[PDB]
Design a binder for this molecule. Structure first.
Ligand SMILES: Cc1[nH]c2cc(C#N)ccc2c1CCN1C[C@@H](C(N)=O)CCC1=O
Ligand SMILES: [Zn+2]
Length: 139
């Protein structure tokens, strides 16, 4: 689990969105596993606007942060789950690192701010849903 709080928005994995998230829906994209809902309190997370390929992510299944190198956002094949059939997920970045399904939502950050959240994994790889292109999260 985990979310990004920026301005009047909450960014979560679309497959983990709650009833309140869907009743205050701003935008969702199944192909990216993202959902954004509106909040009443103001968030102070900063979103990165960069092309970094190094950062640190939080891994709840180890209660630890790990530094990683990660690929550029792209269309990558993701195996089936209870939430989606097997498909291409877009705007996804892979890194070599530990992750389990419950790790979804852990933040990946670089020196510029929040880059994305854990969304996929398996085989010693961890995949992050990018949020750096969502310029409207700031405006
Ligand atoms: C973060 C992670 N690490 C894993 C390791 C293993 C192992 N072994 C298995 C799964 C994972 C997952 C999450 C897989 N997943 C993908 C999500 C999506 N974005 O399509 C939908 C829900 C879901 O469970
Ligand atoms: Zn950066």
């Amino acid at each position: 689990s985990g979310a990004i709080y920026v301005g009047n928005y909450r960014v979560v994995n679309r497959h983990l969105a709650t009833h309140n998230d869907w009743a205050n829906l701003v935008w969702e994209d199944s192909s990216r596993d993202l959902l954004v809902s509106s909040t009443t309190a103001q968030g102070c997370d900063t979103i990165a606007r960069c092309d970094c390929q190094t950062g640190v992510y939080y891994c709840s299944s180890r209660r630890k942060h790990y530094p990683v190198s990660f690929s550029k956002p792209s269309l990558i094949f993701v195996e089936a789950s209870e939430y989606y059939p097997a498909r291409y997920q877009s705007h996804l970045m892979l890194a070599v690192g530990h992750s389990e399904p419950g790790d979804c939502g852990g933040i990946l950050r670089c020196q510029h701010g929040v880059v994305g959240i854990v969304s996929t994994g398996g085989n010693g790889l961890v995949g992050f849903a990018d949020v750096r292109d969502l310029l409207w999260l700031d405006e």
